[PDB]
Symmetry: C2
Subunit: 166 residues, 2 copies
């Protein structure tokens, strides 16, 4: 801000930066809660996709575990008529089948009852993104960003006063 034109240009620069920061309004310490919420929502999605993946392999897919176990049970039927061991094993296989079906059903409940919220997740990511952008210019911490803005505002007022006198 040495020459008159330089000062004019400096005034614009400072005003821009103070404006950019004030608009986002970073509050130091806010990222703690954002990060916690980010991981919570991200994990919720992961949990829901896992449960659904298990349901497909166990029950719903064209090829599935319950389906093969059921075929096995049926293949044992004629044998079970003549041999007590096969009869016993067929019966234990039916119980295994019921367990697999019960598990698939409870996994289905997990996926269906999920509190995953993709819009919420996007909002959390958006705020972290706004703060990151400030930190990449005025950082490295939010404390640093806030002080940058405060020093810019003080410098700006000094230059406006200089212009006021000239």
């Amino acid at each position: 801000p040495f020459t008159q034109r330089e000062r004019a240009r400096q005034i614009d620069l400072l005003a821009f930066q103070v404006q950019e920061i004030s608009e986002v309004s970073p509050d130091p310490g806010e990222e703690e809660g954002l990060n916690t919420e980010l991981s919570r929502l991200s994990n919720l999605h992961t949990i829901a996709q896992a449960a659904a993946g298990g349901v497909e392999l166990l029950s719903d897919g064209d090829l599935n575990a319950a389906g093969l176990i059921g075929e096995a049970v049926r293949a044992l039927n004629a044998g079970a008529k003549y041999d007590e061991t096969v009869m016993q094993l067929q019966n234990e296989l039916r119980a295994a089948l019921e367990s697999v079906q019960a598990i698939a059903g409870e996994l289905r409940d997990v996926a269906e009852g999920s509190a995953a919220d993709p819009e919420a997740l996007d909002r959390v990511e958006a705020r972290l993104s706004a703060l990151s952008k400030l930190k990449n210019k005025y950082g490295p911490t939010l404390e640093d960003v806030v002080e940058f803005g405060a020093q810019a505002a003080e410098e700006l007022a000094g230059l406006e006063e200089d212009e006021r006198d000239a």
Copy 2:
């Protein structure tokens, strides 16, 4: 004329007598055969049942244990963060173990089978030979044996007539 007819009748009867005698049907033998057929066929069914189960649960390119295993792995990422998913995954491991254990016992059934494909085929072959005879000379093996006795007697009378015919 009637002479040509007699010659042909001699060949007919001789052939029928030979056919029956070569098989040597013993009326009553079918009871034991049928009992043994069921015994062996049933052993075959048991062994085939255990083999099929092993294939579908474990050994087939596509098998139950393999799919359960994939499902267990699919749950990994969810189990990291959710107690309920983690629990279901553990219950699923238990189900997998049960399925593998069952496939193991089935393999033992097949491996220890007293099935005898050799004996079974031989029992069927005898029953088939007896059935073929009953279809021509039956209905029962008793009838078949009687048919052969009468045929042999008739044959002897014709052969004698021929010898008498030529001095």
